[PDB]
Write an enzyme that holds these catalytic residues in place. Sequence first.
Site, PDB file in Angstrom:
ATOM      1  N   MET A 102     -18.123   0.302  -4.746  1.00 24.59           N
ATOM      2  CA  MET A 102     -16.908   0.104  -5.491  1.00 24.59           C
ATOM      3  C   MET A 102     -16.108   1.481  -4.769  1.00 24.59           C
ATOM      4  O   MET A 102     -16.540   2.429  -4.687  1.00 24.59           O
ATOM      5  CB  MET A 102     -17.049   0.394  -6.987  1.00 24.59           C
ATOM      6  CG  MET A 102     -17.764  -0.781  -7.370  1.00 24.59           C
ATOM      7  SD  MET A 102     -17.095  -2.369  -7.469  1.00 24.59           S
ATOM      8  CE  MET A 102     -15.636  -2.143  -8.764  1.00 24.59           C
ATOM      9  N   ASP A 105     -13.492   5.446  -9.075  1.00 25.00           N
ATOM     10  CA  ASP A 105     -14.012   5.341 -10.121  1.00 25.00           C
ATOM     11  C   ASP A 105     -12.851   6.011 -11.029  1.00 25.00           C
ATOM     12  O   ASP A 105     -11.958   6.742 -10.737  1.00 25.00           O
ATOM     13  CB  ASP A 105     -15.238   6.497 -10.329  1.00 25.00           C
ATOM     14  CG  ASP A 105     -14.954   7.983 -10.140  1.00 25.00           C
ATOM     15  OD1 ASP A 105     -14.169   8.194  -9.346  1.00 25.00           O
ATOM     16  OD2 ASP A 105     -15.540   8.671 -10.949  1.00 25.00           O
ATOM     17  N   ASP A 145     -23.139   4.906 -22.682  1.00 30.12           N
ATOM     18  CA  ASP A 145     -22.608   5.975 -22.169  1.00 30.12           C
ATOM     19  C   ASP A 145     -21.316   5.670 -21.516  1.00 30.12           C
ATOM     20  O   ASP A 145     -21.072   5.554 -20.205  1.00 30.12           O
ATOM     21  CB  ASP A 145     -23.718   6.418 -21.179  1.00 30.12           C
ATOM     22  CG  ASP A 145     -23.426   7.752 -20.662  1.00 30.12           C
ATOM     23  OD1 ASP A 145     -22.427   8.342 -21.045  1.00 30.12           O
ATOM     24  OD2 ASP A 145     -23.869   8.420 -19.548  1.00 30.12           O
TER      25      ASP A 145
END
Lengths: 325, 248, 826
Positions: A102, A105, A145
Amino acid sequence: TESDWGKRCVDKFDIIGIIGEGTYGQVYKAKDKDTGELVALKKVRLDNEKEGFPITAIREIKILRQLIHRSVVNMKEIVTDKQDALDFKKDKGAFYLVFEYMDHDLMGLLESGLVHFSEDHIKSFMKQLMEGLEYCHKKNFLHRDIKCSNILLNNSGQIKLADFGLARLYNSEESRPYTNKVITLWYRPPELLLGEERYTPAIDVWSCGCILGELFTKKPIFQANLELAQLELISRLCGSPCPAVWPDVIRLPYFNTMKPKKQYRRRLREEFSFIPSAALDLLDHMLTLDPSKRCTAEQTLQSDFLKDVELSKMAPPDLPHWQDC
Amino acid sequence: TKPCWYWDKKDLAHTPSQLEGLDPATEARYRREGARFIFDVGTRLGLHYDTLATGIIYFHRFYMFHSFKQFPRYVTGACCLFLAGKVEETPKKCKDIIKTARSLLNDVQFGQFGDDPKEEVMVLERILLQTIKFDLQVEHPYQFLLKYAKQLKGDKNKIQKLVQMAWTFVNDSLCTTLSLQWEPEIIAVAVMYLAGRLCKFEIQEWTSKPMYRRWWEQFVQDVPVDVLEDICHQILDLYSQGKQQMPH
Amino acid sequence: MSYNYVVTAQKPTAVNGCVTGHFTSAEDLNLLIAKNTRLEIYVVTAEGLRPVKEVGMYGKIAVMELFRPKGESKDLLFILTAKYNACILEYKQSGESIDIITRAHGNVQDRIGRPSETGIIGIIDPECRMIGLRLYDGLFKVIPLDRDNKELKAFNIRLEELHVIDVKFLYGCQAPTICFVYQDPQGRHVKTYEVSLREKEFNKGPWKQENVEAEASMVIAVPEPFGGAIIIGQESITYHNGDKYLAIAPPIIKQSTIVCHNRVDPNGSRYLLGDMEGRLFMLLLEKEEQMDGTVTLKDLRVELLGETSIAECLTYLDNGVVFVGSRLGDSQLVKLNVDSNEQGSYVVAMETFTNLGPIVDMCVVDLERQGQGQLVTCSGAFKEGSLRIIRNGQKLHIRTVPLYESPRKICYQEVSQCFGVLSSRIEVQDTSGGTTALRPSASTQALSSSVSSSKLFSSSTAPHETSFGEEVEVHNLLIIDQHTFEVLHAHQFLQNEYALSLVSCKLGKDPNTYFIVGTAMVYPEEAEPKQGRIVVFQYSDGKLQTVAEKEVKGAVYSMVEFNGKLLASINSTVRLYEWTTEKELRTECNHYNNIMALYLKTKGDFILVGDLMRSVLLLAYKPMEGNFEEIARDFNPNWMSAVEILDDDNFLGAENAFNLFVCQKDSAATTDEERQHLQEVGLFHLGEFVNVFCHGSLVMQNLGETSTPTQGSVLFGTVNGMIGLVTSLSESWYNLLLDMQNRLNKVIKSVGKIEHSFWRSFHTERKTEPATGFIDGDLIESFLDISRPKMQEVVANLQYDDGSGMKREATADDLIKVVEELTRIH
Ligand SMILES: CC[C@H](CO)Nc1nc(NCCCc2ccccc2)c2ncn(C(C)C)c2n1
């Protein structure tokens, strides 16, 4: 076959760089030599031999091989260092968990301050995130989380959830003792701050709500260093945990211990007046103190904000690459 | 995508252990001893029934890819239970499994663990994980026995007697290679079928389709009675070979 | 940990705002000029300005306004900092003693809010009943100006209109009224509300909403005789008061965006307007007094006066004197004459105030062989762009070299006794189908000239349509003599080619010294450029010769010479090129794990890469293998402005939030992970935007001067014009100076009562951290300006470490010596 994991060697990837420092080893970005695909290898060090393979990695392997959704990061395979031949005891090589790579973030995009999210981007963003959480919740899995660092975004606008190291299965019929301090302080739900064990899947919803507001404000909502200061900030906005709004608050371990400065009144709608009416409702319901009154993942997808969001028209976030140039 | 974990009975004659010269009876005895070792150790440690079964399934699968003569059975078992604990979130420290193993094993048997028991076990985890191809999630007959039993309605006591007898049959089947031949859903049905046959209960009457004599077809599609009879036969063989009898 | 020292060599020169009032005395006309963190107070005389007082504030001055509430003899000063520190200030003079009183203060930051696109807007009531702050989208903050509000407590009113462009308090209303231009999906509109301190909410406004020009940018509050408001856009100027609506659309203002406004005549008859090409206009309100006893507005007229510097703020001084506060060029004092001169201009420059402008790039070069070193800056933008030669001759001698175009990157080539300078100028699509420049400039006044004929991208087949009147950038390499600063040569790059990087060096076994420029093909359609060139030039015998060209698939944002090879950053790629015996570039090795490789610096075989969002990464060339290796990365995500290497272990970087940080190798070989983690060991909020870091010092050295405790010298240039020096300290010296700061902060009175520790705290919208590893040299150097009683209070109970005496008491004279040694580094 494609299913015979743990045997293929990491030779098959050209390591490109170290993308991050992980819990059980550092994640490296790599290119598949055969296909050219960009992957992310999460190194697993069992050479420590303290108590063997890390349980955080066992959870990420056990859970992700079960979960298949557009908004859930995929583990493509597990590969190994060149293993010693005919001497399995001497071998101390490590294992690598292959994931799709990816580009960014959410925290990295926001910390740079570069991205600007329109209501229609936040709709495409949260619809994917909450649809992914719905998939996990329908499968009786809790992420535990949910933070900005764990939400991964591509330039295309696809969103995937990622670090399942602290995720475990939840059975509603059976209350099970759990670890109370499981979510990052900024995104921790009030029940876990007040010491709640046997927590609901609504702990993840609280985290996602913190993000929902963070996308509009561009700054985290509840920033504190200590568990008490956090309850104070939540209380200044959402109202103090009190018997009326949270009937069972008196049953939590620290309710009498961790009192906020005052018995505050809820001001969420006032301090977030700039948020659109459709979203402010979603934020209000996601950031409800009582886990039994906090909305579910499905309820957020059947909201005026996220329901009519067509997912085919994924909107790329405003990425100002040429700005600095 | 996901690996195939089931073999045909005929294939068990060509396991590595067999081809190194172990006779069929001896491999089966080693399989029972290893499984029961896993069961006994975990029971002393207070482990959940799913944790015990997951270890036993890891174990049984392992010796479809490796030979008993080169990999000691009690060491493998301890390793399987150690990993099963981490998979099923009922973890134990390796030193505690070694301790419990010492209590239950003879000196000759514990000789397999060698000079450093913990090391032999922790070293094997690398091989175990590669052998089971990191397919760590395992389903067991227990959940289906309860899921199917919950849809039965009738005499509370006759159904509870059926469940407990069947549950005993599930525990007993872990000692066998049935875990490697039939999906757990079929096992749960087979033990329900067996418990019914032995108790002279007609389960169809407790289903939503009381005139559907093949009651299993609403729980498990496409299961011939042959499969259920084979599984039943294999379970009762354990009782006839031993001194133990059907629970009833 | 790491220990470093930061000092200001030249203070901010850019004017950020200017107001006129009666601040020092009810009798004097004052000009309060504001540069970042610095307030300058002047008194208006027959001479343009008389300087009286200058103060520094521990904050970036964002709002500056003068107000005189009923009961005060003279104007009071309101200031709000960019970190939301608010205060009210008073001038007080006792004979020869001048001091600034903090009358009220507080921090008005909200726990929850979205910062607005158009920025902090601050306005004050006509009756001085309240101060309105537009800090966040959807919220209007009111600080009521009652006598008791010494803490500046305030309340927010909900604002339905989320996107506001400009808001100003209106004159001539029964109750305080805000007039604001806002934007929603239907266009832009002008609306009015009323503000009720008793009800703490908005009530319906005096006059109706009107949809206004889509590019309406500024609201002028017209004084009471005329009433109403004027809205300035790019094509039109409109006046709205109740039912009356007037609209003038002169063809002259469409040419350049108007950015500043000021009132010439107090009744509002005449207003000053200024635009970005430097034109200064006069907005005239034509009175139409009616026999009914009423004064009404007849028409709006615009008259061009002349040329000024590109103005950020305009302030009219009393008698045809205008103060041109500029951020892109020199600030000025101009006179508006009633009669035009023979060229048609009514504007004649009086005085010129040096502004180092935006410092886009700079280099240190010893032009006279003195060992002192001079600083050559790329300064200014557009018509105000120039080179500046700066030498520490205490004041600095500054020579200015006007270029009339934007300078971008500079590098010195000693072999050629000249500088290479990248520059860009603005041309406009004209009727010929080509473009025409608005003004002559360096790249058009070169002695000799050349134009790239490269065929690399000539295959095109990609359409880019042109509309008449649109702007384009034209990029050039300038060859400029080091003694005369004559433009000897100008090379023009390809159409739509942007020059981004420039170096001067020899490569390989090639004895020739080359100018090497990195370019990018910039098309409006592209998000990230996908074509580019590296071009090798040779300046020989007054002509630039093209030696070789290498096509790249991106933008060459930065290039640096690496041990005879060319280190280049094609967006997201770091590449090392070798220079062959055939005079062509050949790729040796690549690194691909970046988002954008904007900045590159090297030391030995180490490379420090600065990324758009991924902070800094230490790379190494492994000569044995012929490839790169990632030594360590700063994993905390930061937006970069410039990077520099301090030593083999410490690395310096600047953020787009006006912050500085230093990252060190974790120097722990226990785990590979620790080695690969650069840990930020220094955090500091500078308050300026750092474009360039440069190793050097302008200090004159005859060798007689002993080495100061500070070791190393990094100079940096900023966008507000500030120049600074970063230097390292020993653990012992840091602790002394740090302990001394904490003592000085208790002793020194801050303007606005702003905590020094708060000011220097690392600050992004998301995070605030206490400063670490940095000594604010300016605070240390103010020890020599505090009174002797305060000096003894500062040195009381002060001990030394790691010296001949483990614990040694400090005398005030001893510190006066230490600080004086530190004042020599700059
Ligand atoms: C679980 C999140 C962490 C922290 O960002 N690590 C992380 N970051 C991923 N991309 C981010 C790439 C950032 C970057 C880009 C260029 C240069 C330096 C740094 C990523 N993509 C897939 N994964 C899986 C292994 C979970 C990922 N994990």
